[PDB]
Amino acid sequence: FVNQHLCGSHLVEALHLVCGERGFHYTPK
Amino acid sequence: FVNQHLCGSHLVEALHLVCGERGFHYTPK
Amino acid sequence: VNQHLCGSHLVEALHLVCGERGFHYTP
Amino acid sequence: IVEQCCTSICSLEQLENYCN
Amino acid sequence: GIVEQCCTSICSLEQLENYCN
Amino acid sequence: GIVEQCCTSICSLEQLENYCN
């Protein structure tokens, strides 16, 4: 598991990093 | 306002903040 | 300043205001 | 909100309300 | 969704990857 | 896509809103 909760910009930027060139989709639910 | 220059995380976070509850989809292209 | 960088500057400001808490879209 | 702070100047107190 | 998984709860790298395009 | 529109060129709010879900 990841080490911490990821909320808001922290979660958006985690997805941004992890998904890289594939890109991602974010729905705040 | 005038058109904006947005790259990298600034662009991703702009989309986060603009789209709000709708969420967004991001592909770096 | 460069009005084309307002959004960019806003995101930078939120980063420094909220520091390590992170931020979200609603107040 | 990008609309408000780029159609005006936003204070510190207003930015803090967006923090997690 | 990903907020419930990763913000309310604690998630995994695999769960984050499920939201890559 | 949005990078070409907002990083290579400069883009409007309406163009960002096109990438909302």
Author numbering:
A (entry chain B), B (entry chain D): 1 to 29
C (entry chain F): 2 to 28
D (entry chain E): 2 to 21
E (entry chain A), F (entry chain C): 1 to 21
Task: Copy text from the publication.
In 2021, we reported the development of insulin icodec, a basal insulin analogue with a long half-life that would allow once-weekly dosing (A14E B16H B25H B29Nε-C20 diacid-LγGlu–2xAdo desB30 human insulin). Insulin icodec is a once-weekly insulin analogue that has a long half-life of approximately 7 days, making it suitable for once weekly dosing. The Insulin icodec molecule was developed based on the hypothesis that lowering insulin receptor affinity and introducing a strong albumin-binding moiety would result in a long insulin half-life, provided that non-receptor-mediated clearance is diminished. Upon slow and continuous dissociation from this albumin-bound depot, insulin icodec activates the insulin receptor and elicits its biological function.
Next, we determined insulin icodec’s crystal structure to find out if the stabilising effects of insulin icodec substitutions have a structural explanation. The crystal structure of insulin icodec contains three icodec molecules in T conformation in the asymmetric unit: two that form an insulin dimer (molecules 1 and 2) and one additional insulin molecule 3. Importantly, side chains for the mutated amino acid residues in positions A14, B16 and B25 occupy roughly the same space as the corresponding side chains in human insulin. Lys B29 is pointing into the solvent, and the fatty acid attached to it is disordered and not visible in the electron density, as has been observed previously. Structurally, icodec molecule 3 differs from the human insulin structure in the conformation of both termini of the B-chain. The C-terminus of the B-chain deviates from the dimer-forming β-sheet conformation from residue B25H onwards. The observed conformational differences between molecule 3 and molecules 1 and 2 are a result of the trimeric arrangement in the crystal. When looking at the 3D structure around the disulphide bonds, the A20-B19 environment is affected by the substitutions in the icodec molecule. The side chain of Arg B22 is located directly above the A20-B19 disulphide bond and alteration of its conformation and dynamics will change the solvent accessibility of this disulphide bond. In insulin icodec, B25H is forming a hydrogen bond with the side chain of Asn A21.
